Write a protein that holds these residues in place. Structure first.
Motif, PDB file in Angstrom:
ATOM      1  N   UNK A 142       0.882  -1.204   0.000  1.00 12.08           N
ATOM      2  CA  UNK A 142       0.000   0.000   0.000  1.00 12.08           C
ATOM      3  C   UNK A 142       0.905   1.235   0.000  1.00 12.08           C
ATOM      4  N   UNK A 143       0.635   2.206  -0.894  1.00 18.03           N
ATOM      5  CA  UNK A 143       1.329   3.505  -0.819  1.00 18.03           C
ATOM      6  C   UNK A 143       0.361   4.670  -0.746  1.00 18.03           C
ATOM      7  N   UNK A 144       0.560   5.560   0.226  1.00 20.81           N
ATOM      8  CA  UNK A 144      -0.188   6.835   0.284  1.00 20.81           C
ATOM      9  C   UNK A 144       0.700   7.948  -0.255  1.00 20.81           C
ATOM     10  N   UNK A 145       0.222   8.853  -1.124  1.00 23.16           N
ATOM     11  CA  UNK A 145       0.836  10.130  -1.430  1.00 23.16           C
ATOM     12  C   UNK A 145       2.147   9.903  -2.124  1.00 23.16           C
ATOM     13  N   UNK A 146       2.423   8.874  -2.888  1.00 18.63           N
ATOM     14  CA  UNK A 146       3.739   8.703  -3.540  1.00 18.63           C
ATOM     15  C   UNK A 146       3.989   9.786  -4.606  1.00 18.63           C
ATOM     16  N   UNK A 166      -3.204   5.332  -2.635  1.00 18.04           N
ATOM     17  CA  UNK A 166      -4.151   6.433  -2.319  1.00 18.04           C
ATOM     18  C   UNK A 166      -3.516   7.754  -2.665  1.00 18.04           C
ATOM     19  N   UNK A 167      -4.206   8.572  -3.453  1.00 22.53           N
ATOM     20  CA  UNK A 167      -3.605   9.812  -3.926  1.00 22.53           C
ATOM     21  C   UNK A 167      -4.635  10.916  -3.762  1.00 22.53           C
ATOM     22  N   UNK A 168      -4.211  12.076  -3.276  1.00 24.19           N
ATOM     23  CA  UNK A 168      -5.122  13.214  -3.183  1.00 24.19           C
ATOM     24  C   UNK A 168      -5.437  13.703  -4.594  1.00 24.19           C
ATOM     25  N   UNK A 169      -6.691  14.086  -4.841  1.00 20.20           N
ATOM     26  CA  UNK A 169      -7.080  14.642  -6.160  1.00 20.20           C
ATOM     27  C   UNK A 169      -6.580  16.065  -6.380  1.00 20.20           C
ATOM     28  N   UNK A 170      -6.110  16.712  -5.309  1.00 20.75           N
ATOM     29  CA  UNK A 170      -5.609  18.087  -5.354  1.00 20.75           C
ATOM     30  C   UNK A 170      -4.161  18.152  -4.937  1.00 20.75           C
ATOM     31  N   UNK A 171      -3.467  17.021  -5.022  1.00 24.23           N
ATOM     32  CA  UNK A 171      -2.063  16.934  -4.630  1.00 24.23           C
ATOM     33  C   UNK A 171      -1.225  17.685  -5.668  1.00 24.23           C
ATOM     34  N   UNK A 172      -0.578  18.764  -5.227  1.00 22.81           N
ATOM     35  CA  UNK A 172       0.212  19.601  -6.121  1.00 22.81           C
ATOM     36  C   UNK A 172       1.349  18.847  -6.759  1.00 22.81           C
ATOM     37  N   UNK A 199     -10.819  16.756  -3.581  1.00 19.42           N
ATOM     38  CA  UNK A 199     -10.694  17.736  -2.531  1.00 19.42           C
ATOM     39  C   UNK A 199      -9.628  17.512  -1.471  1.00 19.42           C
ATOM     40  N   UNK A 200      -8.757  16.519  -1.639  1.00 18.97           N
ATOM     41  CA  UNK A 200      -7.696  16.261  -0.660  1.00 18.97           C
ATOM     42  C   UNK A 200      -6.378  16.458  -1.387  1.00 18.97           C
ATOM     43  N   UNK A 201      -5.402  17.047  -0.706  1.00 17.39           N
ATOM     44  CA  UNK A 201      -4.074  17.269  -1.300  1.00 17.39           C
ATOM     45  C   UNK A 201      -3.073  16.289  -0.703  1.00 17.39           C
ATOM     46  N   UNK A 202      -1.800  16.671  -0.695  1.00 18.15           N
ATOM     47  CA  UNK A 202      -0.756  15.837  -0.143  1.00 18.15           C
ATOM     48  C   UNK A 202      -0.854  15.759   1.376  1.00 18.15           C
ATOM     49  N   UNK A 203      -0.504  14.610   1.976  1.00 17.34           N
ATOM     50  CA  UNK A 203      -0.556  14.468   3.457  1.00 17.34           C
ATOM     51  C   UNK A 203      -1.976  14.513   4.060  1.00 17.34           C
ATOM     52  N   UNK A 204      -2.983  14.171   3.226  1.00 20.56           N
ATOM     53  CA  UNK A 204      -4.384  14.206   3.594  1.00 20.56           C
ATOM     54  C   UNK A 204      -4.690  13.207   4.713  1.00 20.56           C
ATOM     55  N   UNK A 205      -3.798  12.227   4.926  1.00 17.61           N
ATOM     56  CA  UNK A 205      -3.977  11.251   5.988  1.00 17.61           C
ATOM     57  C   UNK A 205      -3.069  11.463   7.217  1.00 17.61           C
ATOM     58  N   UNK A 209      -1.619  17.545  10.291  1.00 15.50           N
ATOM     59  CA  UNK A 209      -1.205  18.324   9.124  1.00 15.50           C
ATOM     60  C   UNK A 209      -2.301  19.328   8.710  1.00 15.50           C
ATOM     61  N   UNK A 210      -1.930  20.513   8.237  1.00 16.37           N
ATOM     62  CA  UNK A 210      -2.939  21.422   7.710  1.00 16.37           C
ATOM     63  C   UNK A 210      -3.626  20.817   6.457  1.00 16.37           C
ATOM     64  N   UNK A 211      -3.000  19.834   5.806  1.00  9.67           N
ATOM     65  CA  UNK A 211      -3.625  19.137   4.667  1.00  9.67           C
ATOM     66  C   UNK A 211      -4.535  17.956   5.029  1.00  9.67           C
ATOM     67  N   UNK A 212      -4.615  17.597   6.307  1.00  6.90           N
ATOM     68  CA  UNK A 212      -5.413  16.427   6.706  1.00  6.90           C
ATOM     69  C   UNK A 212      -6.864  16.625   6.349  1.00  6.90           C
ATOM     70  N   UNK A 213      -7.498  15.615   5.765  1.00  5.81           N
ATOM     71  CA  UNK A 213      -8.938  15.688   5.473  1.00  5.81           C
ATOM     72  C   UNK A 213      -9.569  14.452   6.103  1.00  5.81           C
TER      73      UNK A 213
END
Length: 233
Positions: A142-146, A166-172, A199-205, A209-213
């Protein structure tokens, strides 16, 4: 933070520590956790503890030991973020894959192991998780945010064991054309899954983090647990 006395030795004789959590009940599958760009820090401690609570054992190796042993940086602090970026920039990806390979063999032979090993990676570790999936060292990955997955597509048909991303749809780090390349390329191998969290960016998990959703992290983590569950006895 690492577990005192734990040493793992790699292909070339380099040794490294790890944070290890033994399972609530033996035997148990063992999850190797590939850390973020911040080393073995509070979020790794929380992830170890979570997986143990869920019926796993867990091993989180010190992948920065080839540069600076015992790296454990707090992303709340600017100076520590800067140190994290500098370490990542110099990180030897191929050596990290070899170090993970050694941590995986170590995990496999732990005394409470049920013979099955998974890997879960976040950030730096999410990119490492894809490379490990291509090598085929674990039963499930499993990889998050690669980052940079779009540059590794020719490894898609090498994947012979299930892997979930798992990848954020708004990950810059993963703008629209990269998202489309990854989506199309990974979709050709049904052993791969890639889920986008709109609606989630990098580090959403990453809690704190300010990016946590919270809703996206919830769905991703639930899918992770359901994906790893078949490793359990």
């Amino acid at each position: 933070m690492l577990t005192e006395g734990i040493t793992i030795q790699s292909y070339d004789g380099h040794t490294f520590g790890a944070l290890v959590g033994s399972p609530v009940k033996a035997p148990a599958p063992v999850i190797v956790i590939a850390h973020e760009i911040l080393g073995v820090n509070a979020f790794m401690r929380e992830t170890v503890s979570w997986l143990v609570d869920q019926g796993y054992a867990a091993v989180c190796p010190d992948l920065y030991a080839r540069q600076a042993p015992g790296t454990a940086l707090d992303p709340q602090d600017e100076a520590q973020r800067e140190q994290a970026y500098k370490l990542w920039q110099a990180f030897d990806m191929e050596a990290g894959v070899g170090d993970l390979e050694a941590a995986i063999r170590y995990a496999r032979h732990l005394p409470y192991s049920n013979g099955k090993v998974g890997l879960v990676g976040y950030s730096l570790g999410g990119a490492l998780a894809f490379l490990v999936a291509a090598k085929g060292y674990v039963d499930r990955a499993v990889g998050y945010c690669g980052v940079g997955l779009e540059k590794q597509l020719n490894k898609v048909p090498e994947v012979k064991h299930p892997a979930l991303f798992h990848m954020g749809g708004q990950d810059h780090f993963v703008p629209a054309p990269s998202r489309q390349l990854i989506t199309e390329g990974f979709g050709a191998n049904p052993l791969l899954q890639v889920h986008w969290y709109e609606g989630a960016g990098h580090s959403f998990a990453r809690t704190g983090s300010s990016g946590y959703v919270a809703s996206a992290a919830a769905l991703a983590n639930e899918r992770t647990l359901d994906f790893l569950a078949p490793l359990q006895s």
